[PDB]
């Protein structure tokens, strides 16, 4: 009864994928390869300001009209961004969602970017960065990606403190005209038909070239950053280079992630089938949390160990986790552990694609990455093809690589990269 | 530059004994403030009456 | 009309003489490890050298041609005109110097003590080697010089 | 040749710091003055972690994904 | 409209008398919320030119003087710098008012 | 490195090497000299305070 | 972000002895910037007032001499909201030196001037500068013992006589740069240069 | 003419040096080995507050008494802190100096360290840090020190921003009672008799006879920091491990920095005899400033190049300077250049002790290190006893060592440490 | 650093259908956070004045 998702590749490169849910509510997204990946040092923090400035005036709809008309029908407008790509989403009732797309396409296609409004929401940039940096995992991953790469992936999600007050509307216009092109977009619809989506793509979307600007290939750097800030807990991420999205080894790295532990399956549990948690639990007697970090991108990936530990116990926690990974890389693991890891991974995927937000995010990600949507059963089938030898190869890939380290807290007894 | 800022000529409004720039001041300044304070003193005497 | 002549000679004084053409003169003072400095006020100009006592003769010889044998070349005049424009742009940022110049101008209106040592920008753009020669022939005579040690 | 600051010629006042508790007769050149800078925004008190049960799940495992909205709060998920 | 209306506009521009204080037309507009927002939306160059012209006019009207006739603002050279900003502010205010009607 | 003439007392004070012996900055090109305009045409004469008369000579 | 204001009057020049007395007056008012580590206990009244009321970023007094002329006064950098208050305070200090200078204040200024004159000539560069400038200006090298003899002549009565001669009821020269609309007009600054109570 | 310098080693380890020269004003300084070397991760910035605590209440004098009594005699109290040692210097006219000495005595022996006064002082240390980091050389040197060392010299001269509002009186009392001991101090008096200093030292320098807490042992890590601030100029310091003070290799490294160019000698000069400036001026047609950095401590040393260049032409300047050091590391140099470098070094040393402050700082550091006078002629002949092969092997030890890099500015064209 | 204040009145519970009506009343006033996107143009007058 959820019949089939239909897929369409227009000759200008634009992707349209839609599914006829016959749902009470419709969700329509536009996925653009316009992340923080596509900034050089001249225009840092432009994507953050564009993400915040989606709700400004457009050549065809004013910001009062956009805000009041979205709130008048009860719909939602959201922008979700990562380093690689941005996504615009409207949510509404089926009878209204048509005119909702009108608002969305204005936000994508004809932004006026008036100077006074940009000058108004630079303060919103400062507030949003403060709120997002209230969590320490944010600044750990930001410094980790800054140190781990030389160019095009060391650029932050959040605008640096010097570029605030220095971003003009001309830079946003340049970013739109160079990255919001036709062959970098996927228009995804849930609760709609193909005809209306093809009509609105023919109306608003079919004017730009399509190739745009490529980027700078994300050369690996390595090194470490240590930020002494005086908290109760010390955060430390140690990563190394790993395979990208679409490589045959990304599945093995995800299996190794769920084998080493990537989240508590039981609330207030003890993480029995997590190897890193087992090693640090038999080691220490203080509060801690250790997990495996995976982050695969279009042409690169990072795999490593994340540790939150006490200030005077960080060295033994980090060394226990690292020696656990070193013991995994020598082949000391059981087949039932790999089977439970595959179960954890495919369970996480299937419970990630259940809601409409996660489903539409996965459709847009697949359309932007591969250009060909695959069913979840095919994803589970290629998960099932991972052998344990490829997991041991992934662990040896982590062990025999140049590590990148990011640490924060009281670093009195936190070790260094050569000391590991 | 800031060195391009030059004060314009004030010689039309300027008082008589401060006209030439080649003569030092503090030689007739006492006479100038004596005249102005004499004006103020005569005004105060009249309004006191 | 020669309102930045002393400053522009103060620039070109270290750029070469008749017997020591260009950076070789500079090389000489670095070859003895000495320090060479200058300044120009509204009333006084000074060229001073910190050195060791044991090299007292050579430094005096250097000082001699610096006050009487400066080779004023056209290319050096052009590039030091650009350097002077650069440091008037730099000294515009030093805001207490700006208020110093403004206070001198508004306190000494109509007199030669209002004009700055570096002068206006147009005089930097237009000044010629003959004007600098007239300034140095008029004001660099021996009764007005003190050799201090 | 001691006096480690004077070992470095131009890098004497950069390696050293010279405060003056009682400022003397001669003033230092370049007195210096801070500009009236801005202030950081205020935020509420956060959640401390004092037990192993609260710390579980706090270790990051996925790349950082930010989300803003017109009438939904801004969020970051790892 | 062709022959003398432009001529009467030139004569009225001379007769009103803000040109002999160096002012443009849009400097003479009395502030409202709309005019203050339109002034706030101006770029820095036109804002600084406007504020210098206004304080020059206040200096001239202090001493009961006028500018020399060659420095009077010409009728053709008078630019209407503010009125697109003012028209945009008026348009968005009218949009807000008609939304508040319904 | 050692002495720069400054400090409003007309004295050779002590200053850092980056400003005593390099007074011109590292900025490459001078940008502009913005001209001064006045309200009225002023007779901004530097020498001898313009003219001194009371009629036609 | 900050505003610099310099106020000045005439000083006599190089070859008039009461410059020494004027130097003592500057030593009474002195200098301050935000990094001085005295607190609320500095001896200068203007410094303690500006610390307590949080007015200044820095202030600095000067005496500048050319051939029979010069500029004598003060220079301060502060934010906008403080400017007017400090001008009042600064002028009040001058009027105190014109009217009610005491003896311990003059003694402190004399010791400050002794230390300034001796400790300025430390090293061959300022000594050579003093030699060259003294032969150009005074026509001779004034020895430091002659300076100490002239400093010892200063007492409170002649100091407030000289300060009344050079500061009281005199038109200043005011220069300003920055956010300076709270800096008053010339009439209020000129009116602040005399006391209605003498 | 004065007599020779006079020394005394008291039984509690206090060194006393005195020169009687009948100066019009006298200089008294106490030199303590209590810099920022001796902190750890828990009491960072204690030396910054202790630097500004020189006018607080002691026993025997209040803050009011200290400030009004030093300013009443016209004297001056300052304190200069390097990363290894502090120096408290009072000066004043001769007939007063004894009362000034007891003031310094109190400040160096018995601080009260009340809580309300240090709570008032922490804002002053924030303001002092802002004034100090207003220029870029200080920021990049403190970053370079934080990257080059992992302990005991990564502690900066200025207090970290998180520690402000958190330094208590107990940390100051602990620091004073563990590092301000009599076996680590030198009392030096210029313009005072030896009996006066010996009498004051026998009066009130008899309380802390131990050697204190010592043995921090700074270690070298290397790496890089890259502060993107978007300025028009790019600063970059590239250093490496070099010998400490107490070696002939330290003399070799000083001859090496004066051979490569160690700052200006001519106002608006071109630095013609500098090798680095010669190479970069042959390369670049834009303004620049290249010099040699040499920070030698008692346990380790940093030697490298410091470059200031334009934002786009930074790579050419940095690579030309590094290739110049590489070329002079392979024996390609002339002996006349080494002789001029020796003349520059000895002229700078003789001009350093030319003033009374440089002489007192030099004899304070000599009394702290060896406890005995090194006459200037012995320093000059030790400079003269350096061969060319020593400078060649010093540059070879620089080029073969792992570098510490600190960069600041628009680093789009600035290279990384793998590309030197 | 900053204060949390809650004001409530007694409401009916589950079984009373006018709860749904009360929900619409809350949907008129709604919510606001400092990290929103609409700005002054939100329809809620409390959020707009806040």
Swiss-Prot record, chains A, H:
Transmembrane segments: none annotated. Keywords: Acetylation, Electron transport, Membrane, Mitochondrion, Mitochondrion inner membrane, Phosphoprotein, Respiratory chain, Transit peptide, Transport. The modification N6-acetyllysine is found at residues 33, 166, 217. One of its GO terms (biological process) is response to xenobiotic stimulus. The modification Phosphoserine is found at residue 335. It is found in: Mitochondrion inner membrane. It is a peripheral membrane protein. One of its GO terms (cellular component) is respiratory chain complex III. Pfam families: Peptidase_M16, Peptidase_M16_C. It comes from the Eukaryota. InterPro entries: Metalloenz_LuxS/M16, MPP/UQCRC_Complex, Pept_M16_N, Pept_M16_Zn_BS, Peptidase_M16_C. GO terms for molecular function: metal ion binding; metalloendopeptidase activity; protein-containing complex binding. Expressed in neurons and astrocytes of the cerebral cortex and hippocampus (at protein level). Acetylation of Lys-126 and Lys-217 is observed in liver mitochondria from fasted mice but not from fed mice. The keyword rRNA-binding does not apply. Component of the ubiquinol-cytochrome c oxidoreductase, a multisubunit transmembrane complex that is part of the mitochondrial electron transport chain which drives oxidative phosphorylation. Belongs to the peptidase M16 family. UQCRC2/QCR2 subfamily. PANTHER family: CYTOCHROME B-C1 COMPLEX SUBUNIT 2, MITOCHONDRIAL (PTHR11851:SF226), METALLOPROTEASE (PTHR11851). This is Cytochrome b-c1 complex subunit 2, mitochondrial. The lineage of its organism: Eukaryota, Metazoa, Chordata, Craniata, Vertebrata.
From Swiss-Prot, chain D:
It comes from the Eukaryota. Component of the ubiquinol-cytochrome c oxidoreductase (cytochrome b-c1 complex, complex III, CIII). UQCRFS1 undergoes proteolytic processing once it is incorporated in the complex III dimer. One of the fragments, called subunit 9, corresponds to its mitochondrial targeting sequence (MTS). The proteolytic processing is necessary for the correct insertion of UQCRFS1 in the complex III dimer, but the persistence of UQCRFS1-derived fragments may prevent newly imported UQCRFS1 to be processed and assembled into complex III and is detrimental for the complex III structure and function. Component of the ubiquinol-cytochrome c oxidoreductase (cytochrome b-c1 complex, complex III, CIII). Subunit 9 corresponds to the mitochondrial targeting sequence (MTS) of Rieske protein UQCRFS1. It is retained after processing and incorporated inside complex III, where it remains bound to the complex and localizes between the 2 core subunits UQCRC1/QCR1 and UQCRC2/QCR2. This is Cytochrome b-c1 complex subunit 9. It comes from Mus musculus (Mouse). The gene is Uqcrfs1.
UniProtKB/Swiss-Prot annotation, chain F:
Keywords: Acetylation, Membrane, Mitochondrion, Mitochondrion inner membrane, Transit peptide, Transmembrane, Transmembrane helix. Disruption phenotype: Knockout homozygous mice manifest decreased mitochondrial respiratory activities and impaired formation of mitochondrial supercomplexes in muscles. Mice display muscle weakness and exhibit heat production failure in the cold. It is found in: Mitochondrion inner membrane. Induction: Specifically induced in muscle upon exercise. Expression is induced by ATF4 downstream of the EIF2AK3/PERK-mediated unfolded protein response, thereby increasing formation of respiratory chain supercomplexes. GO terms for biological process: mitochondrial electron transport, cytochrome c to oxygen; mitochondrial respirasome assembly; regulation of oxidative phosphorylation. Residues 1-54 form a transit peptide. One of its GO terms (molecular function) is protein-macromolecule adaptor activity. It is a single-pass membrane protein. GO terms for cellular component: mitochondrial inner membrane; mitochondrion; respiratory chain complex; respiratory chain complex IV. The keyword Transit peptide applies. Pathway: Energy metabolism; oxidative phosphorylation. The keyword Oxidoreductase does not apply. Belongs to the cytochrome c oxidase VIIa family. Interacts with the mitochondrial respiratory complexes III (CIII) and IV (CIV), promoting their association. This is Cytochrome c oxidase subunit 7A2-like, mitochondrial. It comes from Mus musculus. The chain holds residues 1 to 57 of 113 of the full protein.
UniProtKB/Swiss-Prot annotation, chain G:
It is found in: Mitochondrion inner membrane. Disruption phenotype: Results in early embryonic lethality. It comes from the Eukaryota. Expressed in neurons and astrocytes of the cerebral cortex and hippocampus (at protein level). Component of the ubiquinol-cytochrome c oxidoreductase, a multisubunit transmembrane complex that is part of the mitochondrial electron transport chain which drives oxidative phosphorylation. Belongs to the peptidase M16 family. UQCRC1/QCR1 subfamily. Component of the ubiquinol-cytochrome c oxidoreductase (cytochrome b-c1 complex, complex III, CIII), a multisubunit enzyme composed of 11 subunits. The complex is composed of 3 respiratory subunits cytochrome b, cytochrome c1 and Rieske protein UQCRFS1, 2 core protein subunits UQCRC1/QCR1 and UQCRC2/QCR2, and 6 low-molecular weight protein subunits UQCRH/QCR6, UQCRB/QCR7, UQCRQ/QCR8, UQCR10/QCR9, UQCR11/QCR10 and subunit 9, the cleavage product of Rieske protein UQCRFS1. This is Cytochrome b-c1 complex subunit 1, mitochondrial.
């Amino acid at each position: 009864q959820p019949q089939d998702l239909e897929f369409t590749k227009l000759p200008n490169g634009l992707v349209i994928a839609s599914l006829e849910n016959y749902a009470p509510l419709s969700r329509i997204g536009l996925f653009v390869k316009a992340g923080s990946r596509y900034e050089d040092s001249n225009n840092l923090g432009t994507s953050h300001l564009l993400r915040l400035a989606s709700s400004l005036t457009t050549k065809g709809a004013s910001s009062f009209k956009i805000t009041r008309g979205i709130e008048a029908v009860g719909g939602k407008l959201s922008v979700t961004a990562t380093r690689e790509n941005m996504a615009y989403t409207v949510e509404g009732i089926r009878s209204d969602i048509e005119i909702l797309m009108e608002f969305l396409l204005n936000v994508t296609t004809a932004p006026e970017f008036r100077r006074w409004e940009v000058a108004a929401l630079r303060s919103q940039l400062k507030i949003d960065k403060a709120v997002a940096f209230q969590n320490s995992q944010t600044r750990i991953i930001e410094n980790l990606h800054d140190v781990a790469y030389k160019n095009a992936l060391a650029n932050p999600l959040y605008c640096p403190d010097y570029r605030m007050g220095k971003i003009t509307s001309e830079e946003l216009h340049y970013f739109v005209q160079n990255h919001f092109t036709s062959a970098r977009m996927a228009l995804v619809g849930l609760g709609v038909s193909h005809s209306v989506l093809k009509q609105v793509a023919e109306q608003f979307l079919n004017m730009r070239g399509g190739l745009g600007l490529a980027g700078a290939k994300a050369k690996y750097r390595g090194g470490e950053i240590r930020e002494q800030n005086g908290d109760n807990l010390v955060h430390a991420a140690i990563v190394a280079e790993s395979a990208a999205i679409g490589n045959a080894e990304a599945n093995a790295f995800s299996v190794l992630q769920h084998l080493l532990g990537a989240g508590p399956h039981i609330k207030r549990g003890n993480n029995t089938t997590s190897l890193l948690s087992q090693s640090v639990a038999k080691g220490s007697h203080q509060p801690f949390d250790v997990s495996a970090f995976n982050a695969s991108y279009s042409d690169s990936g990072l795999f490593g160990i994340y540790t939150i530990s006490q200030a005077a116990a960080a060295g033994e926690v980090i060394n226990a986790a690292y020696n656990q990974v070193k013991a995994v890389a020598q082949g000391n693991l059981s087949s039932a552990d790999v089977q439970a890891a595959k179960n954890k991974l495919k369970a996480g995927y299937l419970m990630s694609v259940e809601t409409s937000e996660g489903f539409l995010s996965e459709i847009g990600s697949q359309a932007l990455a591969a250009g060909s949507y695959m069913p979840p059963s095919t994803v589970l089938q290629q998960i099932d093809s991972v052998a344990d030898a490829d997991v041991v190869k992934a662990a040896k890939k982590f062990v025999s690589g140049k590590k990148s380290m990011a640490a924060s807290g009281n670093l009195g007894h936190t070790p260094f990269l050569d000391e590991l | 530059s800031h060195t391009d800022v030059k004060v314009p000529d004030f010689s039309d409004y300027r008082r008589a004994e401060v006209l030439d720039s080649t003569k030092s001041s503090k030689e007739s300044s006492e006479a100038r403030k004596g005249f102005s304070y004499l004006v103020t003193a005569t005004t105060t005497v009249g309004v006191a009456y | 009309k020669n309102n930045g002549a002393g400053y522009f000679l103060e620039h070109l004084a270290f750029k070469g003489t008749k017997n020591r053409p260009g950076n070789a003169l500079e090389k000489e003072v670095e070859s003895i490890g000495a320090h060479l400095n200058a300044y120009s006020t509204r009333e006084h100009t000074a060229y001073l050298i910190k050195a060791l006592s044991k090299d007292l003769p050579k430094v005096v010889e250097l000082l001699a041609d610096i006050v009487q044998n400066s080779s004023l070349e056209d290319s050096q005049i052009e590039k030091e005109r650009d350097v002077i424009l650069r440091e008037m742009q730099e000294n515009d940022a030093s805001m207490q110097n700006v208020v110093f110049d403004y206070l001198h101008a508004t306190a000494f209106q109509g007199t030669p003590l209002a004009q700055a040592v570096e002068g206006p920008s147009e005089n930097v753009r237009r000044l010629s080697r003959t004007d600098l020669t007239d300034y140095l022939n008029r004001h660099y005579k021996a009764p007005r010089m003190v050799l201090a040690a | 040749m001691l006096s480690v600051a004077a070992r470095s010629g131009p890098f004497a006042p950069v390696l050293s710091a010279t405060s003056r508790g009682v400022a003397g007769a001669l003033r230092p050149l370049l007195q210096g003055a801070v500009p009236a800078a801005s202030e950081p925004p205020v935020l509420d008190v956060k959640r401390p972690f004092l037990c192993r049960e609260s710390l579980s799940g706090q270790a990051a495992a996925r790349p950082l994904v930010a989300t803003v909205g017109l009438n939904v709060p801004a969020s970051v998920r790892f | 409209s062709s022959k003398w209306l432009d001529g009467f506009r030139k004569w009225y521009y001379n007769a009103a008398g803000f040109n002999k204080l160096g002012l443009m037309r849009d400097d003479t507009l009395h502030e409202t919320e709309d005019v203050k927002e339109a002034i706030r939306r101006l770029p820095e160059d036109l804002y600084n030119d406007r504020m210098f012209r206004i304080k020059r006019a206040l200096d001239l009207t202090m001493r009961h003087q006028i500018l020399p006739k060659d420095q009077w603002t010409k009728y053709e050279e008078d630019k209407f710098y503010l009125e697109p900003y003012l028209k945009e502010v008026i348009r968005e205010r009218k949009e807000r008012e008609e939304w508040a009607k319904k | 490195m050692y002495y720069k003439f400054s400090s409003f007392t007309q004295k050779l004070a002590g200053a850092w090497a980056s400003e005593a012996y390099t007074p011109q900055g590292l900025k490459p090109v001078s940008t502009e000299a913005p001209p001064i305009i006045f309200a009225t045409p002023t007779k901004l004469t530097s020498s001898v305070t313009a003219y001194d008369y009371s009629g036609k000579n | 972000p900050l505003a610099h204001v310099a106020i000045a009057v005439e000083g006599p020049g190089w070859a008039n002895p009461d410059n020494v007395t004027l130097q003592v007056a500057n030593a009474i008012i002195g200098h301050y910037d935000c990094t001085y580590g005295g607190g609320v206990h500095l001896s200068s009244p203007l410094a303690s007032v500006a610390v307590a009321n949080k007015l200044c970023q820095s202030f600095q007094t000067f005496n500048i001499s050319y051939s029979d002329t010069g500029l004598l006064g003060a220079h301060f950098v502060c934010d906008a909201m403080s400017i007017d208050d400090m001008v009042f305070f600064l002028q009040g200090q001058w009027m105190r030196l014109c009217t009610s200078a005491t003896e311990s204040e003059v003694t402190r200024g004399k010791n400050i001037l002794r230390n300034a004159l001796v400790s300025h000539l430390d090293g061959t560069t300022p000594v050579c500068e003093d030699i060259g400038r003294s032969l150009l200006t005074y026509g001779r090298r004034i020895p430091l013992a002659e300076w100490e003899s002239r400093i010892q002549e200063v007492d409170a009565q002649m100091l407030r006589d000289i300060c009344s001669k050079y500061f009281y009821d005199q038109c200043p020269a005011v220069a300003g740069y920055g956010p300076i609309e709270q800096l008053p007009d010339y009439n209020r600054i000129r009116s602040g240069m005399f006391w209605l109570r003498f």
